[PDB]
């Protein structure tokens, strides 16, 4: 997260870290949506050009963390994966279309003051909240600058950007399965997700029922926090049917 600030303790209890078992390596962000399911970006698990094509056994997740590197006694939980599910139509060769994946935990994790799931949006909630100018929140332990890494979880709030504006800001082909967010050239405010934040959640707090909903997944961008550019996110509601199918299955 570039130009954000430290998260307060317990501020994003659905935040998940995705690690490579050996060598141990913090790979990406992810989010907890139930006691046994974690949502992330498909490119964190499958992106051949970066030599990424992981199986359940290659990975591990840590939940409840705040510090990026220090062990947090009786707070953080480690979980193994039972199965990974990547969207069947994820397009890594072209534009990361449908950059989404589910991971089933080998065992349900216990909720606590530091571990708690985020909500997935229903049609009504998506219609009301996913509108240009409305702000969402992104969190992660990714790079502090385009390139270094934070000692603790970072957070930044960003406005959803009008589709045509997103489209004219890049030559990369955008689809309905993505949305972009970020401040404009004139705005004094700045901020963006960056490398390493992929898979992390773009959440919004409903002013109707006071619950936090995950509307997006950090997916891609060109550089980080450059004026004139915007960060791109996987559109969660758009892929909600696939998500439901995997979980029901």
């Amino acid at each position: 997260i570039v130009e954000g600030s430290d998260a307060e303790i317990g501020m994003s209890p659905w935040q998940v870290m995705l690690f490579r078992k050996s060598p141990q390596e913090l790979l990406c962000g992810a989010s907890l949506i139930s006691d046994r399911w974690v949502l992330t970006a498909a490119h964190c698990l499958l992106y051949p050009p970066w030599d990424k094509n992981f199986t359940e056994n290659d990975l591990l997740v840590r939940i409840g963390k705040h510090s990026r590197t220090r062990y947090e006694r009786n707070i953080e939980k480690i979980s193994m994966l039972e199965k990974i599910y990547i969207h069947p139509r994820y397009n890594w060769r072209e534009n990361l279309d449908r950059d989404i994946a589910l991971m089933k935990l080998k065992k349900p994790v216990a909720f606590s003051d530091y571990i708690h799931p985020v909500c997935l949006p229903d049609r009504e909630t998506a219609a009301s909240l996913l509108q240009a100018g409305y702000k969402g929140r992104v969190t992660g332990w990714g790079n502090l600058k385009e390139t270094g890494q934070p000692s603790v979880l970072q957070v930044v709030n960003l406005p959803i950007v009008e589709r045509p504006v997103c489209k004219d800001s890049t030559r990369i082909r955008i689809t309905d399965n993505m949305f972009c967010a970020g401040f404009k050239v004139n705005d004094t405010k700045r901020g963006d997700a960056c490398e390493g934040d992929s898979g992390g959640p773009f959440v919004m707090k409903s002013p109707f029922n006071n619950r936090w909903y995950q509307m997006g997944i950090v997916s891609w961008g060109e550089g980080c926090d450059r004026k004139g550019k915007y960060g791109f996110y996987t559109h969660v509601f758009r892929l909600k049917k696939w998500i439901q199918k995997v979980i029901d299955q």
Binding site: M11, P13, K205, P207, N210, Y213
Partner: peptide, 28 residues
């Protein structure tokens, strides 16, 4: 279920340091 309600914030009726920024964006 209980999703989206944080134990240290909503459950204790406490506001985090920047969520007001999101609420206010629903106006402007």
């Amino acid at each position: 279920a209980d999703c989206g309600l944080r134990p240290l914030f909503e459950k204790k009726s406490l506001e985090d340091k920047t969520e007001r920024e999101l609420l206010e964006s629903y106006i402007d």
